[PDB]
Design a protein around this nucleic acid. Sequence first.
RNA 1: AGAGUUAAAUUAUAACUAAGCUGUAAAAAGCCCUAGUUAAAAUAAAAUAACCCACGAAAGUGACUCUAAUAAUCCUGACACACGAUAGCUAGGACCCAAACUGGGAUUAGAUACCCCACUAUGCCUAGCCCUAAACCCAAAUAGUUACAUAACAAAACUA
Lengths: 97, 86, 58, 56, 122, 49, 137, 99
Amino acid sequence: SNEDLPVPMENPYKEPLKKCILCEKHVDYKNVQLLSQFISPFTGCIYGRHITGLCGKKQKEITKAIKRAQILGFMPVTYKDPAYLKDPKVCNIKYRE
Amino acid sequence: ANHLKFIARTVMVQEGNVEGAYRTLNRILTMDGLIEDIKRRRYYEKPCRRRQRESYETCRRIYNMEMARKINFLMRKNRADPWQGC
Amino acid sequence: ATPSLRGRLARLGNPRRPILKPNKPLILANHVGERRREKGEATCITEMSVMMACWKQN
Amino acid sequence: QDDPPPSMLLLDYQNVPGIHKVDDVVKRLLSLEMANQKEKLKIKKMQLMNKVLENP
Amino acid sequence: PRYELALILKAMQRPETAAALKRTLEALMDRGAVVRNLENLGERMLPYKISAHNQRHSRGGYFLVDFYAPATTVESMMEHLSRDIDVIRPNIVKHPLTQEVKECEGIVPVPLEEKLYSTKKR
Amino acid sequence: QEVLQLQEEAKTFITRENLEARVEEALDSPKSYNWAITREGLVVRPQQK
Amino acid sequence: SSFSIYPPIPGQENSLRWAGKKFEEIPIAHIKASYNNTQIQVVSAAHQPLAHASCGTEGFRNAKKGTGIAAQTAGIAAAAKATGKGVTHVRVVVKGLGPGRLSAIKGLTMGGLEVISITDNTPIPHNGCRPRKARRL
Amino acid sequence: VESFASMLRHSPLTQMGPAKNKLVIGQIFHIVEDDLYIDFGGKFHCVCKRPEVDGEKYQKGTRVRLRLLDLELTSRFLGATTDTTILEADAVLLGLQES
RNA sequence: AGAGUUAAAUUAUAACUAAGCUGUAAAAAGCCCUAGUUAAAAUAAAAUAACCCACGAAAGUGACUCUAAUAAUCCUGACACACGAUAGCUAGGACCCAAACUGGGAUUAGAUACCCCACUAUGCCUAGCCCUAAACCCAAAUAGUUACAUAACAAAACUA
Ligand SMILES: [Mg+2]
Ligand SMILES: [Mg+2]
Ligand SMILES: [Mg+2]
Ligand SMILES: [Mg+2]
Ligand SMILES: [Mg+2]
Ligand SMILES: [Mg+2]
Ligand SMILES: [Mg+2]
Ligand SMILES: [Mg+2]
Ligand SMILES: [Mg+2]
Ligand SMILES: [Mg+2]
Ligand SMILES: [Mg+2]
Ligand SMILES: [Mg+2]
Ligand SMILES: [Mg+2]
Ligand SMILES: [Mg+2]
Ligand SMILES: [Mg+2]
Ligand SMILES: [Mg+2]
Ligand SMILES: [Mg+2]
Ligand SMILES: [Mg+2]
Ligand SMILES: [Mg+2]
Ligand SMILES: [Zn+2]
């Protein structure tokens, strides 16, 4: 008959889960800008998770999208398109030190 | 080859100092694994050798990561000790 | 962040097939390694070649 | 071999009201014409379970 | 929308481009297609130089055709577009608007794996 | 809801008649699918240029 | 002072001149740096060969011509023959990963020639031809 | 008489909830040159560095204001059966006990 | 499993320019119908993503597109049935590059090897065979338990 005993509720303080920059966006092969954000400017390589920082789902999606856009003739493979050079940098890599 | 030339893997020299420019370039290429891949492709490596190399490298990375993590987690306690000659 | 260790190693419970085959067990040791001494290379070779060109000419 | 006709208006859209009043184009997009193979399979399944069975 | 035809056309003047687009759309409706929309992504310099039909191309016009077609016919359309000398390069894709976005509820963090080894005292 | 939805969409489709018109129309109005993101999870669109 | 590492795209209005020429009009120094040898060829922007120098052309022999000293010598020789045809500036293109990369570059600099951009074009197959077998079976 | 449950429910630590980013009052019970060993009253002392602004105002017995990050600094590491306790708390030293 | 497609290389092949190029711990032999740059089909192979861990019964599968498609209201089960890496066999087609064999060059007391160059069967496609692997995650399948309890080592111990 003690009313000071704890209640078996789930954690109220529990934070929301953090989100990929793209959580509930739509990656489309047709838009070369968003894609070329995740590409190395000098090489044309695709950055990995440790760099882009995405849910597995969206890293996959970006990748497949990039490949498709590359062979369909939308986006260049061997460099980032100069036009998109000065777009926001979301990636964590620093070349010049 | 079918891409436009001079847009990729290219660095412009600043104020005529070439060494620093080449260094920047080499750091770029190393960053993207391009150097390791140039080197690895000089001789063919059979798929199982490759598989092994990848597995080992990932194990190595896990260990290094974890060790660096315990290091930085423990770094605070490198301070001079309060209780000396207790 | 650290590459995941879930489902990687061969174990009696694990459904799938091994990804990593560890050579030695993955356990954090209580010491680190000793720094590898830098491999030396020839020094002054540039100034040498300059001087040798000078000599060959004069 | 049976023949689930090209116009047969796939399974989920058959029982929605006033379907036949709709113009030829929309009727055609909901046809087995524009359909997948899996749609024809749904239809074939239904038809067979109705022909053969007691309690579908 | 069901299929998405990505069309890269030879870069040309107004009348010839309108011509090619027309006969292409007709060719689509002939294989039994229903064309929902036509979009224009403009003309750009191509990502890389594309060799097609004894010509090496630098620039080109970009177009999207969203349409419904019987599954059978895609191959047919492709064939047609292959032998068109005004098309720099065709591609046909399941329309991106057919696939719907499931909800990333967040990143579930992965705990470090445990009991990988025994309790042996080394 | 789906049947009525497509009933509405169908009004807009290209037909043998609409061909010349919709073609000449689409030749006039370039669209872009292009957009970028910011580290915040925000969308950035180019049309402000 | 705003300095971009990235080069000047052709369609751009960008104004930078070295002896009055656009970035595109500058001659190109191709350096093939391979494990056994280093070849250098300076060429017009119009792809007309100006000058050719190699470690073999420079009077070295088999093993010797692999080294960086030989690469530097060939770089100097190249820059001499090139300035003879009056090229002040050059864009470097380095093909290959070898002993004579940097040596041949700063051997172009030492040979009285000015380097503006330094590009690396090294063949990187995305998996074409299988390379020859590993040594020491 | 007070049941232990009764006391625990109403204690100041129970009232705080999650210890992340909490403004707390704490006392300096020990000093090494730049190191201020601060008992904020939870379990473990934290250890802060002596700021440059009013450096000599911090002495044994002084009271200060903290932003609590972690009650106990702890993590599990590769191939271990239990976690690894640093036997400290994690805090930010803000200023001293404005009064 | 089908059908269609090709970004990076690479090469036939020309056009300039250079006398050398290639090759090693070091050389020789080879090639100068060679080399560098600028053009380029076919063939073959599929950087980065992948610090991911999905699909398939296993073998296997990670360039692009589309079509078809991943048994069982789910216990075990053959010598029956259907598959089965690499190599190999038969027939036709392909051949960039790699390469058992073989022939040259070094090495060595010898060197029928390791190293260098050249070239073949073969790797590829179609159709049919062959039915083996350290086909091993050396851990049977299906349900469970974390109780009793350390031969050693390894991937902790067990029930039906
Ligand atoms: Mg499986
Ligand atoms: Mg072992
Ligand atoms: Mg062996
Ligand atoms: Mg086949
Ligand atoms: Mg090619
Ligand atoms: Mg041939
Ligand atoms: Mg000889
Ligand atoms: Mg590839
Ligand atoms: Mg099944
Ligand atoms: Mg059975
Ligand atoms: Mg077999
Ligand atoms: Mg044969
Ligand atoms: Mg052969
Ligand atoms: Mg060979
Ligand atoms: Mg012999
Ligand atoms: Mg075979
Ligand atoms: Mg196996
Ligand atoms: Mg066995
Ligand atoms: Mg069994
Ligand atoms: Zn997400």
